[PDB]
Amino acid sequence: ISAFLKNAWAKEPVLVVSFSVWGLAIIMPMISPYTKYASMINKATPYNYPVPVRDDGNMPDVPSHPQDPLGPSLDWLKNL
Amino acid sequence: RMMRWNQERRRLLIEDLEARIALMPLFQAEKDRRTLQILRENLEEEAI
Amino acid sequence: MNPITLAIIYFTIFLGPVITMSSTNLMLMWVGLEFSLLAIIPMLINKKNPRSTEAATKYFVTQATASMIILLAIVLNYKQLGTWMFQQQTNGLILNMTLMALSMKLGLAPFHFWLPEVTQGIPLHMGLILLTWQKIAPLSILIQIYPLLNSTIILMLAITSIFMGAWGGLNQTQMRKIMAYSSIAHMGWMLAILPYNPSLTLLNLMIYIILTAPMFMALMLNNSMTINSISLLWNKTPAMLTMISLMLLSLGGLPPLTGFLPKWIIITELMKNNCLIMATLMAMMALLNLFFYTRLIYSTSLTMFPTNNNSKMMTHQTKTKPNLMFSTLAIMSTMTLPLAPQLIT
Amino acid sequence: VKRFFESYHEVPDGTQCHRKTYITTALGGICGIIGSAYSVSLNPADSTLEAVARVGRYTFTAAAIGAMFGLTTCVSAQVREKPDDPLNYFIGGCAGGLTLGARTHSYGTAAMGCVYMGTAAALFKIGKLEGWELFPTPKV
Amino acid sequence: MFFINILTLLVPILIAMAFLTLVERKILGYMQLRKGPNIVGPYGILQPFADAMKLFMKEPMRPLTTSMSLFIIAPTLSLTLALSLWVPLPMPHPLINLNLGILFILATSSLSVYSILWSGWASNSKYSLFGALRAVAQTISYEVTMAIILLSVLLMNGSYSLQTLITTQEHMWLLLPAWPMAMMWFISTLAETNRAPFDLTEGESELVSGFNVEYAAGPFALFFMAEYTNIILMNALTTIIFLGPLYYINLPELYSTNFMMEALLLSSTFLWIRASYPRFRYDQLMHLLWKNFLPLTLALCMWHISLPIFTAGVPPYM
Amino acid sequence: MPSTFFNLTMAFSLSLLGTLMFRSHLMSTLLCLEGMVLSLFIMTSVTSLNSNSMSSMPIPITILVFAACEAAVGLALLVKVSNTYGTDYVQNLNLLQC
Amino acid sequence: PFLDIQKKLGISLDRHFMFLSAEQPYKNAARCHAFEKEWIECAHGIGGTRAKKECKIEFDDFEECLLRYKTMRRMHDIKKQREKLMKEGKYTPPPHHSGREEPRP
Amino acid sequence: PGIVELPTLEELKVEEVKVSSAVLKAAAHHYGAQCDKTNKEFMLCRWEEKDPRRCLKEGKLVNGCALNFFRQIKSHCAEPFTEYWTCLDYSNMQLFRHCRQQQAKFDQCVLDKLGWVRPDLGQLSKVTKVKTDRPLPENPYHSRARPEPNPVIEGDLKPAKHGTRFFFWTV
Amino acid sequence: MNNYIFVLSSLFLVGCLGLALKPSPIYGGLGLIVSGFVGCLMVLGFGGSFLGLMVFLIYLGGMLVVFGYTTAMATEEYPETWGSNWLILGFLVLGVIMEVFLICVLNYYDEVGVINLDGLGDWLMYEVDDVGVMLEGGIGVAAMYSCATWMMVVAGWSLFAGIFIIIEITRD
Amino acid sequence: MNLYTVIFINILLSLTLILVAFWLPQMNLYSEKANPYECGFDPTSSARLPFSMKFFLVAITFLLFDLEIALLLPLPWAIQTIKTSTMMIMAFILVTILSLGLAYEWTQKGLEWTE
Ligand SMILES: CS(=O)(=O)C1CCN(c2cccc(Cn3cc(-c4nc(-c5ccc(OC(F)(F)F)cc5)no4)ccc3=O)c2)CC1
C-alpha cells in the first residue's frame, strides 16, 4: 500500500492532503487538553443580565456581592 | 498567535459586557420611567 | 442503477412518509412530502422513454404546486396564532385550501386527471408504490386534523371521486388506468368518513393496499398491461385465475369478501351521523365500479380468449415467481371478513 | 348571496311564483356556467368565439330548465292546492327534462331527464319536509 | 459632508482605474522589451484621458438584432456595482459600516455577472452568446470555493464585518495561518474579474471580443473601467483580509498608506500574471476549481472549524 | 405589517395563477414556482422577525433548500424533455391519452 | 402524533420549538410569550373542545397581543378625531408632540 | 374593557444623571461594586413583578446612589477620571484597551482616596443574592384559576359485556 | 418614509405579476432577481439582514443556472416580452390598475387590519429590546447546529439525495 | 439612507455617461453598419437558437452546493454556543456528506462534459 500512497503523493497530492486534513480535524479535538475550554469561555460571557435571587436565608453557597469570594472564578481564563 | 489573540479578545469582551451589566439597572429605570411618561402624555391628549 | 443509488433513493422514499407521520411540526410534514416526491421521480424515469419523461413531468409539477399551497397554509397558520401545528382557532379558508392541496396530491377528483396518465406511463412496481405508499402521508396529515375539516367539501370530493372513478375505469382497456381509477374511488371512500371516524379510513386503506398489491404482482408476473394480455393467463398461469377473480370481486365490494367490509362499515358510521344520501349514491356507484371488474373476470377466467402459437414456449419453461407474499395477501384480502370485529376496532 | 336562494323557502309553494322562477333560473345559469367552464377548459374549441358560443348555449339551456322547473312547480302548487306534495316537484323536474330534450332535440333525453329530475326534485321536497341533511355535521 | 466624502471616494477610484490601464500597458511593455505610452504626455499620463474622451466622442451602435433595454442596462449595472463595492471598505474607516459587509461584497459581485449575461444575450450575436455562456461556466466554477474560503478565514475573525479583520490582524497577518486559502482566493479573484489566465469571457483568440463584440465606444468604456476597478477592489480585499496594514488608532493615515502599497503590489502582480502565462480552456477552469480547490477547501474549512475548539481560540462576537 | 402580508399573499396568488395557467414554455412555470417560494420565504421571515421568535428562522432556510432541490429535478426533467422533443413545449407531451 | 415515536423514545426532534413560548437563543423572549404560556397552561388536560370555550379569554388576549387589531383601531380613531379637530381648528398639539420636548434623561 | 393606570408626571420625577456614555463605561466597574445592593434590589423587584409601575421608588434610589457615586468622584478625583473618559470617548466603540495608562491613574487615585478596588474579570457577571423587605407576588402573571380537568374513570378492567356487540357475531 | 415598506411590497407584487405573465424565461429570471432584491430590502427593513442577503445570493445563482438552461432549451427565434404581445401588456397594465383599485376600495369599505393608508408606517417593528446585544438573525439560523439539529440533517440529506437523483435522472 | 444615497449617485453617474455618449457624438446609421457581426460575412442563422450546454449537470450540482454554503455560513455564530460538541459534529457531518456527494459525482463522471 505504501507504494500506492507514494505514487498518489507524487501524482495526486491534493486529495492526499485533503484526506489528511479531514482526519486531523476529526482527531485533534480528541487529543488536545484545551478543548474543554471552548464551551467554558462561551459560557463565561455575560450576554445577558445575571438576574439576582431572593435572599431566602438558605443560600450559603451564593454570594451577596460580586467581590464576595464566592461563585465561579475566571482565573483559569485570566492565565491560560 | 491567533489562539492567544482571540483569548485576550474574549477577555476584553468579558470586560465590556461586565460594564454593560453594571449599567443596565440605570438604563432600565430610565426606560421604564420614560415609557410611563410618554404613555401618560398620550393619555392626557387622548382625554382632551 | 447501482446499489448505492438504489439504497439512497429507496431509503428516502421510505423516510419521507415516516417523517410526516412521526412529526409534530407541519413544516417537517412538508419536507417529508418533498422527500417522497423528489425520490420517487428517478424510479419513474428509469426506463428513459418519452412516456416516462412526461409522466415524471406531470407528477412533479402537480405535486410541487400542491406542496407550495400546503406551505402557504402552514405559513398563514404561523402568522396567525403564532404556532406551527393547526388548532381549533384556525381559518377555515386555510384548512380548506390545505384539504384541496392534499387531494390534489392524493389524486382525488376533480384533481385526478393526472393520476391515470402518470400510472400508465411508468412500470408496474412503481405504480404499486405510487398508489399504496405515497397515499399515506397526506392521509396522516388529514387524520391529525380531522376535527377541523369541512364535511361539505370532503363529501363533494368523495362523491365526485366515486362517480369519476367508475365512469372512467368503465371504458379503459389498459389495466394501469383501471387501477388508477380504483384508487380514486377507494380514496373517495376513505375520505368520505374521515371527519366522523378516521379509524375506518385507515382500515379501508390497509384493505385497498393488500388488495391492489397482489393484483399488481399478477400483472408483473407476465408483464400484463391490457385486457387482451390477461386473457392469456389460462395458458400461462392458470393457477392465478382463482385469486385474481376473488380479489377483483372483493375490490368491487361483494360479500362474503373483505372488500365489502369498508363499504359496509363506512355506510354504517355515516348513517350514524345521518348521511343517508351520500352513502346511498356511493354504494350505487360502487356497483358500477364492480361492473368492469366483472367484465375483466369474464375476459380472464370465466372464458378463454384466443392464444398464440408461441405461448407454447412459455409453457415449456419454468418460473420462479410469484413469492410467498402474493398468496398471503390474496388470502388475507378475500377470506378474512369473519374476523371483521378484530379489523374494525 | 345565499339569502336570495333561501328566499325560496320563506313562503310555501304556490306563492311568489315569479320569485321562485327567478331564483331557479339563476341557479340553472350558475350550474351552466360551471359546466361550460369545465367544457371549455377541457375539450376546448377551435376558436374563442366558438367557446363563448358553447358557454352561452349551455348556460341558457340550464337557465330554461330551472325556469320551467320552478314555474311549473309553483303553478301546480297554486292550482291543485297541495303545496306540500312532492308530486308538484316531480312534474316540475319532468318539464325541465322535457326542456333539456327540446334543446338537445332528443325524445330519449326528454324521457330520461323527466324520470330522473322528477325523482330528484321529489326527494328534495321530501328532504325539506322530513328534515333530512345532505352535508351534515359530525355529531355521532 | 457625506457627498464630499462620496466624491473623495469616487473620483480617485476612477483616476486610479485610468492610471492602472496606464501601468498595465507600461509594465507589459517593459516585460515585452518595449516602452509603452510615452508620447501623448510626460511618460504617458494622458493616454487614458485620450482614450476615454475619444470613446465618448464616437458614434455608438444601436444594432437591429439587439434588445436595446438590456443592451443599455448592462454597462450601467457593471459600473454601478464596480463603484458600489468600494463603499464598505475600511481604509481604515469605511463610508458605510455594514455588519454583513462580506456578504454585500459576495452578492454584488455575483450580481455583476448579469451585466455580461444580459449584454451577450441582448447583442444577439453568436460570439456574444459564447462569452455569456463562458461567464456562466466561470461563475459556476469559482463561486463555490469563494464563499467557503472566506468562511474558513472568518472563523478566526468572528464575524462577516470588514472592520474586525483589522483588530484580528492587529498583531500578525492572516496569511500565515491561511496561506493555502490565500492562494486559492487569489486565483479565484483572478477568475472573478475575467482576468488572465481566465480572460475567457472576452477571449480575443477564440471570441473576437465576447460580450463586447457588438458594444461600442461609451458602453464599452463603462465595461472596461468596471473591470479595471474590480481589479483594484479585489486586491484591496486580499490586502485587508490576509495582509494587515498597521492600525494605530492615532494613525489611520499609515494604515491607508500601507493598504495602498499592498494593493499596488497585488495589482502589479495581476498584470505580471497576464504577461507571463497563456490562457486556460474554460472546461479546465471548472476541473481545477472542482477537483483541486473544492476538496482542499472543504478539508481546510473543517480544519478551521476545529482549530478554534482544540485551541480555545474561538473569536468574539463584537 | 398587515399591508406587507396582504401584498405578499397577493403575489403568491399571482405566481400560483401563472403556474396553473400554462403557456408553451415550461421553464416559465418553474420560475413562477420559484416566485411562490420567494413570497413564502419572505412572509415567514417577516413573521419571525415581527414575533422576535429566533427559534423559527431555521425554517425559511429549509424552505429555500427544498425549493432549490425541486428546481434542480425540474431542470433535469426539462433536459430530458428537450432531448426527446427538441423543445420544452407542453403541447408535445400529450401521448398518454391512449 | 400519528406515530408518537418521539413520545415513546423520549426525545424531541421537532417539538421543542413549535410555539413562541419555547426556549429561544440566549434566553430572549418572543412577544406575546406570557399570553401564549397562559393559553397553553389553560388548555392543558381538558382537550381542544373545552379549550375553545374555557381558554377563550386567554386565547383572545393572545390574538390581540400578536395581531393587535384593536390597538390599531383605537389609534386610528384617535388620529382621525385629531385630524378632524385640526381641520376645523379645535386643537393644537402640545410641544412634546411636535418635536419640541424635554428629552429625558 | 378595564382601565390601565399610569403614574402621574410628577410621581416619576427624579434627579436625572444627564451624563454621557463613555463616562459611564469608564466608571462602571467601580459603580458595580459600590451600588450592587440597590441596583440588584431594583432589578429583582423588576423581574419578580414584571410591571414598571410597582418598581419605581427602587429606580429613584438607583438614580440617587449613582449621583452619590459620581459626586464622590467629582469631589476627589475629577481630573484623572476626566482624562480617562476623554481618552475613551474617542474610539468608535469606546474600548478600554486604548486608554490603559489613564485607567490605572484613575484606579490608583480611587484606591488611595476612597478605598475602592476594581472588580476582577468575572465578578460582576455572576448571580448574587439580595435581601429585600418586599413579599413574593402571589400571581405575577395575573392568571385566572385553571379549568377543572376531566375525571379519570376508576375501576379494574374487565371483559366486554357479551364481547364485541357487532351485528351477528357471538363473541 | 412610512410609504417605504408598502412601496417595496408593491414592487414585489408587480415583479411577481410580470413573472406570472410568462415572457421568455430571460425576462422572467430578470423579474425574479428584482423581486429577490426587493425581498432583501424589505426583510432588512423589518430587522433581519442575514436572511435577505442569503435569499439574494441563492436566487442569483439559480437565475444564473436558469439563463444557462434557457439559452439551450427554452429559447425561440423571436423571444416574447411584456411589450411584444398587446394582450400581455394590456393585462399587465390592467393588473396594476386593479391593484390600485383594490387598495383604494379596501381602505374605504374594509377595516384597518389589512390596508390602512392612514396609519401607514406605524406598524413595522412592533416591539424591540432597546438594551440588547444578541439579536442578530444568524443566531436563529445557527440554532440549527446546536438546538434544531433535526432540520440540519434533514436538509443535508435532501441535498445528498438530490445529487444522486439528478445524476440518475440525467443518465442517458 | 446613506447607502441609498451612494448607490443612487452611482446610478446617476453611469446614466449621465450613457446619455452624453448617445447624444454628444455625430451619427450616421445604415443597415450594413447596424447588422450583426460574424467575422465579415453574413450570419447563417439567428443567435436565438438552442446553444447546447455540456455542463448542465455541474450547474445543477452547483445549486445544491450553493445551498450547502448557505448552511455553512452561520458557523461564526454557531461557534459562540455552549453546545460545542454538537456544532463540531454537525459541521463535520455536513462537510463530509458534501464531499461524499462530490466524490460520487466525480467517479460517475458528472463533472466531465458531454461531448
Ligand atoms: C499586446 S499588449 O500586451 O501590449 C496589450 C495589453 C492590453 N493593452 C491595454 C491595456 C489597457 C488599456 C488599453 C487601451 N484600451 C482602453 C479602453 C478604455 N479606457 C477607458 C477609460 C475610461 C475612463 C478613464 O478615466 C477617466 F477618463 F478619467 F474617467 C480612463 C480610461 N475607456 O475605455 C478600452 C480598450 C483598450 O484596449 C490597452 C495594450 C495592448
PDB file of N, CA and C in Angstrom, chain H residues 117-156:
ATOM      1  N   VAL H 117     -11.818  49.474  45.044  1.00  0.00           N
ATOM      2  CA  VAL H 117     -10.973  48.495  44.374  1.00  0.00           C
ATOM      3  C   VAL H 117     -11.728  47.967  43.164  1.00  0.00           C
ATOM      4  N   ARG H 118     -11.005  47.734  42.080  1.00  0.00           N
ATOM      5  CA  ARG H 118     -11.650  47.411  40.815  1.00  0.00           C
ATOM      6  C   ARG H 118     -12.026  45.934  40.778  1.00  0.00           C
ATOM      7  N   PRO H 119     -13.244  45.593  40.360  1.00  0.00           N
ATOM      8  CA  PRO H 119     -13.603  44.182  40.214  1.00  0.00           C
ATOM      9  C   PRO H 119     -12.678  43.454  39.252  1.00  0.00           C
ATOM     10  N   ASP H 120     -12.639  42.137  39.407  1.00  0.00           N
ATOM     11  CA  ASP H 120     -11.815  41.274  38.578  1.00  0.00           C
ATOM     12  C   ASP H 120     -12.607  40.845  37.343  1.00  0.00           C
ATOM     13  N   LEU H 121     -12.090  39.852  36.618  1.00  0.00           N
ATOM     14  CA  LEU H 121     -12.563  39.586  35.264  1.00  0.00           C
ATOM     15  C   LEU H 121     -13.995  39.068  35.232  1.00  0.00           C
ATOM     16  N   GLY H 122     -14.413  38.309  36.240  1.00  0.00           N
ATOM     17  CA  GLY H 122     -15.706  37.651  36.182  1.00  0.00           C
ATOM     18  C   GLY H 122     -16.582  37.838  37.402  1.00  0.00           C
ATOM     19  N   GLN H 123     -16.375  38.927  38.140  1.00  0.00           N
ATOM     20  CA  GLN H 123     -17.108  39.121  39.386  1.00  0.00           C
ATOM     21  C   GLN H 123     -18.495  39.704  39.141  1.00  0.00           C
ATOM     22  N   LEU H 124     -18.597  40.724  38.289  1.00  0.00           N
ATOM     23  CA  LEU H 124     -19.891  41.342  38.026  1.00  0.00           C
ATOM     24  C   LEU H 124     -20.815  40.454  37.206  1.00  0.00           C
ATOM     25  N   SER H 125     -20.291  39.411  36.571  1.00  0.00           N
ATOM     26  CA  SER H 125     -21.053  38.599  35.634  1.00  0.00           C
ATOM     27  C   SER H 125     -21.829  37.473  36.299  1.00  0.00           C
ATOM     28  N   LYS H 126     -21.833  37.394  37.622  1.00  0.00           N
ATOM     29  CA  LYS H 126     -22.383  36.246  38.323  1.00  0.00           C
ATOM     30  C   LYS H 126     -23.616  36.648  39.122  1.00  0.00           C
ATOM     31  N   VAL H 127     -24.234  35.648  39.740  1.00  0.00           N
ATOM     32  CA  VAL H 127     -25.547  35.777  40.354  1.00  0.00           C
ATOM     33  C   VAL H 127     -25.357  35.939  41.854  1.00  0.00           C
ATOM     34  N   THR H 128     -25.734  37.102  42.373  1.00  0.00           N
ATOM     35  CA  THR H 128     -25.698  37.356  43.799  1.00  0.00           C
ATOM     36  C   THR H 128     -27.060  37.038  44.408  1.00  0.00           C
ATOM     37  N   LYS H 129     -27.165  37.199  45.721  1.00  0.00           N
ATOM     38  CA  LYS H 129     -28.426  37.060  46.432  1.00  0.00           C
ATOM     39  C   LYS H 129     -28.694  38.350  47.190  1.00  0.00           C
ATOM     40  N   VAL H 130     -29.857  38.943  46.948  1.00  0.00           N
ATOM     41  CA  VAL H 130     -30.234  40.221  47.532  1.00  0.00           C
ATOM     42  C   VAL H 130     -31.354  39.986  48.532  1.00  0.00           C
ATOM     43  N   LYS H 131     -31.334  40.750  49.619  1.00  0.00           N
ATOM     44  CA  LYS H 131     -32.336  40.653  50.674  1.00  0.00           C
ATOM     45  C   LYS H 131     -33.180  41.919  50.646  1.00  0.00           C
ATOM     46  N   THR H 132     -34.460  41.764  50.330  1.00  0.00           N
ATOM     47  CA  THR H 132     -35.414  42.859  50.337  1.00  0.00           C
ATOM     48  C   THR H 132     -36.545  42.551  51.308  1.00  0.00           C
ATOM     49  N   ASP H 133     -37.220  43.610  51.750  1.00  0.00           N
ATOM     50  CA  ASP H 133     -38.332  43.501  52.684  1.00  0.00           C
ATOM     51  C   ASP H 133     -39.681  43.568  51.977  1.00  0.00           C
ATOM     52  N   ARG H 134     -39.737  43.113  50.729  1.00  0.00           N
ATOM     53  CA  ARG H 134     -40.970  43.005  49.976  1.00  0.00           C
ATOM     54  C   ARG H 134     -41.382  41.541  49.858  1.00  0.00           C
ATOM     55  N   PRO H 135     -42.678  41.255  49.809  1.00  0.00           N
ATOM     56  CA  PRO H 135     -43.122  39.865  49.704  1.00  0.00           C
ATOM     57  C   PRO H 135     -43.096  39.362  48.269  1.00  0.00           C
ATOM     58  N   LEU H 136     -43.025  38.044  48.142  1.00  0.00           N
ATOM     59  CA  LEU H 136     -43.157  37.426  46.833  1.00  0.00           C
ATOM     60  C   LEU H 136     -44.564  37.660  46.297  1.00  0.00           C
ATOM     61  N   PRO H 137     -44.717  38.082  45.044  1.00  0.00           N
ATOM     62  CA  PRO H 137     -46.061  38.173  44.470  1.00  0.00           C
ATOM     63  C   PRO H 137     -46.749  36.818  44.475  1.00  0.00           C
ATOM     64  N   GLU H 138     -48.081  36.853  44.522  1.00  0.00           N
ATOM     65  CA  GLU H 138     -48.848  35.613  44.523  1.00  0.00           C
ATOM     66  C   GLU H 138     -49.117  35.130  43.105  1.00  0.00           C
ATOM     67  N   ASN H 139     -49.478  36.045  42.207  1.00  0.00           N
ATOM     68  CA  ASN H 139     -49.727  35.713  40.807  1.00  0.00           C
ATOM     69  C   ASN H 139     -49.192  36.855  39.955  1.00  0.00           C
ATOM     70  N   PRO H 140     -47.900  36.828  39.620  1.00  0.00           N
ATOM     71  CA  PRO H 140     -47.334  37.939  38.842  1.00  0.00           C
ATOM     72  C   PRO H 140     -47.906  38.039  37.444  1.00  0.00           C
ATOM     73  N   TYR H 141     -48.361  36.928  36.874  1.00  0.00           N
ATOM     74  CA  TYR H 141     -48.982  36.922  35.560  1.00  0.00           C
ATOM     75  C   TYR H 141     -50.466  37.255  35.611  1.00  0.00           C
ATOM     76  N   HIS H 142     -51.041  37.382  36.806  1.00  0.00           N
ATOM     77  CA  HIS H 142     -52.461  37.689  36.964  1.00  0.00           C
ATOM     78  C   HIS H 142     -53.323  36.681  36.210  1.00  0.00           C
ATOM     79  N   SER H 143     -52.910  35.420  36.255  1.00  0.00           N
ATOM     80  CA  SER H 143     -53.633  34.355  35.582  1.00  0.00           C
ATOM     81  C   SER H 143     -54.858  33.941  36.387  1.00  0.00           C
ATOM     82  N   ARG H 144     -55.884  33.489  35.673  1.00  0.00           N
ATOM     83  CA  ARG H 144     -57.103  33.026  36.308  1.00  0.00           C
ATOM     84  C   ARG H 144     -56.913  31.617  36.860  1.00  0.00           C
ATOM     85  N   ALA H 145     -57.942  31.133  37.549  1.00  0.00           N
ATOM     86  CA  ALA H 145     -57.926  29.770  38.058  1.00  0.00           C
ATOM     87  C   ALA H 145     -58.028  28.787  36.901  1.00  0.00           C
ATOM     88  N   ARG H 146     -57.091  27.846  36.844  1.00  0.00           N
ATOM     89  CA  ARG H 146     -57.077  26.898  35.744  1.00  0.00           C
ATOM     90  C   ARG H 146     -58.390  26.114  35.716  1.00  0.00           C
ATOM     91  N   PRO H 147     -58.851  25.716  34.533  1.00  0.00           N
ATOM     92  CA  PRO H 147     -60.076  24.918  34.452  1.00  0.00           C
ATOM     93  C   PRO H 147     -59.962  23.628  35.247  1.00  0.00           C
ATOM     94  N   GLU H 148     -61.093  22.959  35.382  1.00  0.00           N
ATOM     95  CA  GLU H 148     -61.136  21.688  36.095  1.00  0.00           C
ATOM     96  C   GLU H 148     -60.867  20.547  35.124  1.00  0.00           C
ATOM     97  N   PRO H 149     -59.870  19.702  35.373  1.00  0.00           N
ATOM     98  CA  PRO H 149     -59.596  18.598  34.449  1.00  0.00           C
ATOM     99  C   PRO H 149     -60.757  17.618  34.409  1.00  0.00           C
ATOM    100  N   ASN H 150     -60.669  16.685  33.467  1.00  0.00           N
ATOM    101  CA  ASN H 150     -61.758  15.727  33.347  1.00  0.00           C
ATOM    102  C   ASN H 150     -61.539  14.558  34.301  1.00  0.00           C
ATOM    103  N   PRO H 151     -62.588  14.091  34.974  1.00  0.00           N
ATOM    104  CA  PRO H 151     -62.414  12.978  35.912  1.00  0.00           C
ATOM    105  C   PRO H 151     -61.873  11.741  35.216  1.00  0.00           C
ATOM    106  N   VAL H 152     -60.995  11.030  35.913  1.00  0.00           N
ATOM    107  CA  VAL H 152     -60.468   9.761  35.427  1.00  0.00           C
ATOM    108  C   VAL H 152     -61.391   8.650  35.907  1.00  0.00           C
ATOM    109  N   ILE H 153     -61.998   7.938  34.959  1.00  0.00           N
ATOM    110  CA  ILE H 153     -62.793   6.770  35.302  1.00  0.00           C
ATOM    111  C   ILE H 153     -61.927   5.792  36.077  1.00  0.00           C
ATOM    112  N   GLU H 154     -62.451   5.297  37.190  1.00  0.00           N
ATOM    113  CA  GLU H 154     -61.739   4.337  38.013  1.00  0.00           C
ATOM    114  C   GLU H 154     -62.441   2.988  37.959  1.00  0.00           C
ATOM    115  N   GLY H 155     -61.689   1.947  38.289  1.00  0.00           N
ATOM    116  CA  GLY H 155     -62.220   0.597  38.327  1.00  0.00           C
ATOM    117  C   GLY H 155     -61.300  -0.362  37.605  1.00  0.00           C
ATOM    118  N   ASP H 156     -61.267  -1.600  38.086  1.00  0.00           N
ATOM    119  CA  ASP H 156     -60.478  -2.625  37.427  1.00  0.00           C
ATOM    120  C   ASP H 156     -61.062  -2.930  36.054  1.00  0.00           C
TER     121      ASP H 156
END
